[PDB]
Design an enzyme around this catalytic site. Structure first.
Site: not given
Ligand SMILES: [Mg+2]
Ligand SMILES: [Zn+2]
Ligand SMILES: [Zn+2]
Lengths: 55, 152, 65, 94, 280, 48, 258
Positions: E21-23
């Site tokens: 999730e975009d981390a």
């Protein structure tokens, strides 16, 4: 008869408040725990003095 | 998913209840465990999102096998309480034992769960028809027969 | 702003090779041959020398005491 | 390095090894896994930040030998292998 | 002449689930050696404002008898004239200019740093305003090494906060010896359709190997097929994939991992400015 | 008490006291801006 | 049996082949070399005056990044508890010019910067820079400034290219150009991947069926590079000593438990 989860929440809250205020614990508990898990264990063992009144 | 949050700078607030009644209400009424099933449509709302699906497919993919080291390491990492490995399925060319992903996954499920359905990968409906025929005919076919008719 | 002492990725010391590379490239030599001569085979090191800017001269003129 | 025992049942031993990380833990478990008398053995790091330097182990034997004997034998084998490699390297460099 | 950002060695790969999730996952040793390091300035202004009737405020260390006088600890860095020494380590709620104003005895009106800030005094200047009143400005600088929660974004609209700082020895490496400085999740590509990011990764790899920068000027830029051909000629796989070994187990990863060099810029939305908690 | 200051523009040495000076001025070049110089004491900086 | 073969040896890097050992042992050796071997490095800096255009923290970090010579005989580098010996380096320079790493004066002659040509900062006319830097032993796992060098390995594999592939002469010439050893049999040509050997695009269709890679069990090609802090052959010895000491300490603790 079955406890609705709201009734169980209120019973736990009242019992925890009483235990914190100074009421004795009806069952033996591990050391170093807050009143809340004490009340939760009391409920889990089924030893509860408080009862609910329904209309 | 329930929070609808992405880790790209999103911020969150937390509040600490003070009184015992509030703490009991939060613990009993508001814990994450009790809110797995969404009130909206009656289905789950908490579950895998991106890696929890793709990696699951990789683990249970047809023809995927793992060596003893990987099996022990993944079982310990997942926290699964185990103390003896099941019987190996198929042996490596040089003699090392191997375990299929399906058994490793089955080590997580309860002891009496039983279900069957069609997933999104069904592209040859004939095989699903044959499997459904067998299952409906018997309701408990011998697992040997299912192995020949297996289909992902 | 000045040239980094070590490559960020692998830690190889490349701080002292920047001026040599710049002077050789300005002379018209093939940059790839110059980098190979200096002894930078991994592109992680080559990036540090290729993409660097010398801003210390630009920011040196304003003093604060 | 200090062993902190979590649970000690029969033929089973689960303990922390404070002061170590993947470097020694992986070597130890891989040396153990080739012992025919070890039924199951593995290690894990519960949290990469808080438990970065406190691996958790689990060793189970078939009862022929206690887990401590297996651990001692594995460590001794590691020592022998390292000494042999050191001698070979010293010979080859000259 | 005034760039902003750095080139990262990025490998597209899922790692421990800490970059879902975009981390993103960043290498510890690279941070230690100077990657993405920055500094934050802030300027405080204090004016010796003269009031009506001739009463004026004054720059001096306030006496313990004045109203509102904070603890003696907060004035430890003050010179006699009420101005803090430059290059003196300062922390939250410490005063910078000691000022006392006439009562509305005298009351403290000193200027102090923000409660949730820290740093070192960098520059102190004294001067006069447009009406003859004295005026001072103090600049405080703070070193801000990257940490969990700091926001990073590429040039193709791919943003994210770093979710884990992993030691170098746990980072997977390549047969050619390349250790990635940043690991991104493959799940972020298909839903966004940023093929320009992958093309830029290939182009950065080619530019680093070849020794000259690669033109990416929109429509008249270098076609990607030419870059792939050049990369193949240079001794690498034409798809940009390489064989990597796992950092922990030491074994060989089963798949071939896409890896390249991508320009990354660090945004100013840093966690050290967002966090604040209220007690009472 | 008298203190030490440096000019913004010419960088020379200028000595004056704020509590008394009614007009800040650099006598050498007339600049109205002055710096406060670094004190001559050692400071420790961690190289981390 | 365990054996080591040297492939090539430069003045700052060595490449060798390790055989007869498990993958876990090779990974452990690599990790110990990367982050357990101790070296000297600048830790704390005490500035007296800094008129440069660079901040104190930047100069301190740049000083920390400078490699330092580390004596081998005097200190027990393989111990699990490094001593707290401290080396003081001083500098006093001013005026126009560039301050180089060779201008650092060390009170201990045994420890000094390896490369005297690393630029630290540029000083304009009249600016002065005076400080004292303190150095002490450390480990790479605590800060990357203490890393002795870089190290990696790879599987020792042999690539089989069947003669039935047309234009295999092109592949052989490419392999020779890369520099890999190459030998020919009657039916196929064997290539030893000392360095990575990536098949070109037009030969991809033959992979697996006609071009397949054989992995020699328990054989790895190591590569160790150093920045001059330690001799490139002493690093491996120190790492192996550290591994032995850790094993002995674990044995002692385990015996204490029982
Ligand atoms: Mg968002
Ligand atoms: Zn490098
Ligand atoms: Zn002046």
């Amino acid at each position: 008869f079955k406890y609705t989860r709201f009734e169980k929440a209120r019973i736990i809250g009242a019992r925890a408040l009483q235990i914190s205020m100074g009421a004795p614990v009806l069952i033996d508990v591990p050391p170093g725990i807050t009143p809340l898990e004490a009340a939760i264990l009391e409920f889990e063992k089924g030893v509860i003095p408080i009862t609910v009144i329904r209309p | 998913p329930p929070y609808n949050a992405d880790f790209d700078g999103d911020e969150m607030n937390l509040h600490v209840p003070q009184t015992e009644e509030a703490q009991a209400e939060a613990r009993i009424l508001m814990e994450v465990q009790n809110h797995i099933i969404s009130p909206r449509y009656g289905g789950p709302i908490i579950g895998g999102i991106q890696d929890h699906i793709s990696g699951g497919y990789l683990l249970t993919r047809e023809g995927a096998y793992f060596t003893r080291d990987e099996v022990e390491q993944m079982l310990m990492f997942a926290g699964v309480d185990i103390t003896e490995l099941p019987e190996p399925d198929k042996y490596d060319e040089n003699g090392n034992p191997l375990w299929s992903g399906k058994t490793i996954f089955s080590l997580l499920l309860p002891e009496d769960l039983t279900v069957w359905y069609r997933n999104k990968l069904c592209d040859e409906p004939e095989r699903c028809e044959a499997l459904e025929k067998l299952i409906e005919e018997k309701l408990m076919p011998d697992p040997e027969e299912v192995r020949k008719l297996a289909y992902d | 702003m000045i040239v980094p002492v070590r490559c960020f990725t692998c830690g190889k010391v490349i701080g002292d090779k920047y001026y040599e590379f710049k002077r050789r490239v300005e002379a018209g030599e093939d940059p790839e041959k110059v980098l190979d001569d200096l002894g930078l085979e991994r592109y992680c090191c080559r990036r540090m020398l290729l993409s660097h800017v010398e801003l210390i001269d630009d920011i040196m003129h304003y003093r604060v005491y | 390095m200090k062993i902190e025992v979590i649970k000690k049942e029969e033929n089973l031993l689960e303990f922390y090894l404070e002061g170590e990380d993947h470097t020694f833990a992986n070597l130890l478990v891989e040396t153990l896994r080739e012992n025919p008398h070890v039924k199951f053995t593995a290690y894990t790091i519960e949290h990469p930040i808080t438990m970065a330097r406190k691996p958790r182990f689990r060793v189970v034997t078939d009862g022929e030998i206690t887990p401590e004997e297996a651990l001692e034998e594995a460590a001794k084998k590691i020592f022998e292998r390292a000494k042999e490699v050191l001698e070979a390297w010293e010979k080859a460099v000259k | 002449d005034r760039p902003a950002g750095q080139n990262f060695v990025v490998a597209v790969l899922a790692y421990q689930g800490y970059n879902m999730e975009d981390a993103i996952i960043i290498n510890k040793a690279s941070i230690e050696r100077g990657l993405a390091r920055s500094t934050f300035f802030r300027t405080y202004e204090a004016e010796e404002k003269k009031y009506l009737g001739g009463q004026t405020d004054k720059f001096e260390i306030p006496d313990p008898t004045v109203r509102g006088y904070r603890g003696e600890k907060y004035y430890r860095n003050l010179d006699e004239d009420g101005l803090i020494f430059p290059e003196s380590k300062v922390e939250g709620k410490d005063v910078l200019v000691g000022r006392t104003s006439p009562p509305r005895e005298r009351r403290e009106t000193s200027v102090a740093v923000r409660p949730s800030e820290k740093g070192v005094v960098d520059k102190v200047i004294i001067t006069e305003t447009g009406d003859g009143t004295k005026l001072v400005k103090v600049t405080v600088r703070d070193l801000r090494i990257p940490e969990l929660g700091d926001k990073f974004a590429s040039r193709h609209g791919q943003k994210g906060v770093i979710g884990l700082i992993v030691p170098q020895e746990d980072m997977p490496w390549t047969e050619s010896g390349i250790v990635p400085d940043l690991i991104v999740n493959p799940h972020g590509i298909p839903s966004r359709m940023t093929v320009g990011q992958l093309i830029e990764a290939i182009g950065g790899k080619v530019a680093s190997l070849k020794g000259r920068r690669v033109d990416g000027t929109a429509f008249i830029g270098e076609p990607e097929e030419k870059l792939r051909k050049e990369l193949e000629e240079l001794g690498f796989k034409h798809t940009g994939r390489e064989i990597m070994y796992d950092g922990i187990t030491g074994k060989r990863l089963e798949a071939d991992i896409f890896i390249g060099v991508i320009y990354y810029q660090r945004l100013h939305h840093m966690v050290a400015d967002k966090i604040h908690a209220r007690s009472r | 008490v008298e203190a030490v200051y440096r000019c913004f523009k010419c960088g020379r040495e200028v000595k004056l006291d704020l509590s008394i000076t009614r007009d800040l001025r650099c006598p050498y070049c007339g600049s109205k801006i002055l710096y406060k110089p670094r004190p001559k004491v050692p400071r420790r900086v961690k190289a981390i | 049996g365990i054996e080591v073969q040297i492939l090539e040896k430069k003045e700052d890097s060595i490449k060798f082949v390790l055989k007869g050992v498990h993958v876990s042992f090779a990974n452990a050796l690599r990790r110990t070399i990367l982050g357990e071997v101790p070296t000297f490095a600048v830790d704390e800096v005490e500035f007296y005056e800094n008129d440069s255009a660079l901040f104190d923290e930047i100069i301190a970090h740049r000083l920390a990044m400078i490699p330092l010579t580390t004596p081998v005989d005097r200190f027990e580098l393989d111990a699990l508890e490094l001593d707290d010996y401290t080396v003081t380096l001083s500098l006093e320079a001013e005026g126009p010019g560039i301050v180089y790493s060779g201008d650092l004066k060390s009170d201990d002659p045994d420890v000094k910067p390896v490369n005297p040509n690393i630029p630290i900062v540029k000083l304009a006319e009249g600016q002065r820079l005076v400080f004292n830097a303190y150095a002490k032993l450390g480990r790479g796992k605590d800060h990357a400034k203490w890393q002795p060098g870089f190290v990696y390995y790879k599987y020792y594999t042999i690539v089989h290219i069947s003669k039935s592939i047309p234009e295999w002469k092109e592949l052989k010439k490419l392999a020779k150009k890369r520099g890999l050893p190459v030998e020919e049999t009657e039916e196929e040509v064997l290539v030893t991947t000392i360095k990575p050997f990536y098949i070109p695009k037009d030969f991809e269709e033959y992979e697996g069926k006609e071009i397949w890679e054989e992995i020699v069990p328990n054989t790895y090609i190591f590569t160790v590079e150093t920045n001059g802090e330690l001799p490139v052959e002493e690093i491996v010895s120190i790492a192996l000593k550290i591994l032995m000491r850790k094993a002995d300490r674990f044995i002692s603790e385990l015996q204490k438990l029982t």
